[PDB]
Amino acid sequence: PAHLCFRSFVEALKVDNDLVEINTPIDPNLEAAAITRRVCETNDKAPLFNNLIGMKNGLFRILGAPGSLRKSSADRYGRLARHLALPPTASMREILDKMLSASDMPPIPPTIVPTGPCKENSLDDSEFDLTELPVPLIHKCDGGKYIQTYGMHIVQSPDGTWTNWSIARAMVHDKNHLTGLVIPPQHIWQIHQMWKKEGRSDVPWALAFGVPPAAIMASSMPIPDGVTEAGYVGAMTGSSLELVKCDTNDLYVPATSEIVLEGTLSISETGPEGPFGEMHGYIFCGDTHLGAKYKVNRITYRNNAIMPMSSCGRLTDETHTMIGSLAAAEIRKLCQQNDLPITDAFAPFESQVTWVALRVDTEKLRAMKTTSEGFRKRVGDVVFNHKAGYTIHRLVLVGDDIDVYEGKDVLWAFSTRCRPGMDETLFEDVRGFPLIPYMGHGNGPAHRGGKVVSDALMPTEYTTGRNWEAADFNQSYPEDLKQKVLDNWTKMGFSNHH
Template identity: 40%
Template sequence: MHYKDLRSYLAALDEIGDLAHITREVDGDLEPGAITRRSCELDAPAPLFENIRGATPGFRVLGAPAARSSRKDMPYARVALSLGLPPAASVPEIVDALIATRDIPGKKPVLVDATNAPCRQNILMGDDANLDKFPIPFAHDTDGGRYANTWGMLIAKSPDGKWTNWSIARVMKVDGKRMAGLIVPSQHIGQIWAEWVKLGQPMPYVLVQGMAPAIACVAGIPIPAGVDEADYVGALWNEPIEVVKALTNDLELPANSEVVIEGHVSLTRDCPEGPYGEYSGYLGTHSSLQPTFHVEAISYRDDPIWPLVVAGRPTDESHTIWAMGMAADATALLRAAGLPVTCTWAPEESAVHWFVVVVPNDWRDVLPDTSTEEFARRVGEILFKADSLVFLPKIYLVDDDIDPTKLSDVVWAIATRVHPSRRQVVFSDARVVSLAHCYEDDEYESGKGPKIVFDTLQPAIGKGRLRHASFDQAYPEDVRKRVLANWPTTTKSPI
């Protein structure tokens, strides 16, 4: 089942017990951020703040919309439900669904009459279009401002109209009429903004809050340049997204959105943005000049819901949906290059600083006369050059006896299969970005530094590979069957 708006998705979370209704009054500054952050760190239900001090009655904030679930039997339920999958779907199943959607013809969105569109229930124009009306909290106490966008979607179109990009990028509220948005040149929105700058024309934009969960997820993952996210979601849903025209420009936006902000972006980086707590798990300490997003119109649903992601120590949306999107892109790139890959994953606890590439036992049949070092080098050459994976500093190439979503497996592999000095393929002059937290100042300044692939591949089965001292491998099949047949189903204890 696909949820076409945020509210039906919240009803589904309620049904599985993964939504916490916070009805007591909370302050409008830091308390929603603090509760959301603690919810992420404890894998607690997603908090829905329904009584925010100073906010218009009925205005709400949703925390942790796609973080790890509170249900231990379905840890990725929020992402799975967002994408229309069963709530118990595993990481490989979710990643495979994202990859498979790439091969389905996209479905263009369909324009509907805006008269009855939920996002047009309330309209503010001119001076009335003011962000001060909305309960935008601080995410962290050292942030440069209230972040108006942490899980909303920016819509921008290339000047020739051939490419419309829907993406998530952080945007800081400056005052009621201005925001400063982080525009990274290598990202798609940065490429489109650069085209408008070349023409000397301000880029029109729409910033949407509270769209259908699949739209938010797809906006937050890498898909190929030139592909419209709206078409990709249409393929995922097997039906087009219903959209309406913006009030002030020719962009189109999801009709069921909670809040819609419209305006134009400055031609220069003219406004300080940041600092902000980031996915690496540390509070930011620096600001930078970024383009100004001027606000010209706002529309919203009755009793609107504003989503809030509080990035930080794992686990939050950076370590779930963003990592899944990166895994889908990495897997697709490696397979397109003819490399046998079972799956890829960035263990949440690594804050997307480790990437595990799992290969099947028969990889030597697919790549005859290829050493493990050569295999590792090819993986690094492909992944470290990809724009979508520029954040990755470390890759572990492992056999498929390792489950990359199980941290105990990954730690065991790193501890027992990574040689202290050998079998490491180093790319000494790779591209480095400031958001990855493991480099030195000179490397950030130059934008260059080392990246590494750890070759942990074991000998082929039957040719020197050690068996595990585990239940699965250290006992005959008849003994294991007898143990399992007599093991109580209601307890972990054999007694």
């Protein structure tokens, strides 16, 4: 099935009429990423580049925009639904519920199998050169060829008890090394730290590209510390994932992985990394810093391997649909587990996924007999002191009438119900997300503060209940009149799903 095998996922997009196969030569230097960028900016069909200039020995085709949006509102999130065995018309609420469902289920550990398609071909250290592969230059100011935008890094705690799967960027350094971001509080960083403190050896590592779509979704989600993503994906899908051992280490990769790199993440060495055109929409040309360094010892890959690629930047791509939404999902749960009356959470695209709107059950709120200042502080302490709140700099609290999955409605509530200053609490002593330009390239500390809880609950939502109705068609007119108007609409001369 498509959720369990990337090759099947590509076939699913084709059958959905959601994929454009480009069989003429396309340059991995900027052209593939430019086409992908335009797809993302216009919600077009995913591009599959079958004829990439410089592809050799089967490495590699590219699929762009794997988790981006479709044009129609009815199946807007269909490419995400296809990661998860959900109907293509699934709502965001349904997708995030699916992604949270495993959080109160027993893990289903993976099953080891002796081989799989990822072993169809191999290149040893004397046979590959990463500078000879058709690795894309994604943005013209990028500081490297970013091979790794949609693969899963696999690292394991020294004691073997936790195996983490996560997305973090990496670019080619030389024939057999990458550099990339490994930053706190991310799990790749947490595990790296464990190995560094042990001080014995570099971290055994693999990077698998074109993994089971359900696994790349979990890779992008801040599920709890110490939780092995493979078991969470197993529980979510109701099926044990099939993994095969790496040839040169004892880590396990999805059997149907398109391309696998095997090697080490150094506990001592660094190398130049970045800049990269990032999720918030910018590239700071020449802004290169030392990053984590990976050595590649072996490549294995499927016949006619396909590399997924995120051509990320301005709206809308994987960095918005997956980073933002999956963090919002985890934050929703975290708030509920802390006894806060939050029903729903979403990161508005309009905020460049730097905000999360939290829908409040105001019946529950009223029973708490609290105030804005107290509630704001409590919510911000829970979220901004936790890893799930890392990427989010503004929380907007809204009452039950707002659909947080609708950015227009979030912006309306924020703009009209939250008095600047008075209805907000600033948080300066929390971890900040340095990738946001106003953090890393701003006026203050790159790694601390810059966060805010903005309360768009109105005063009576804490006491006696909402005391307005909207000045809109829906609420300011009785049902019988509304229906008459709709029934006579085209008749009168005015204009009128899938």
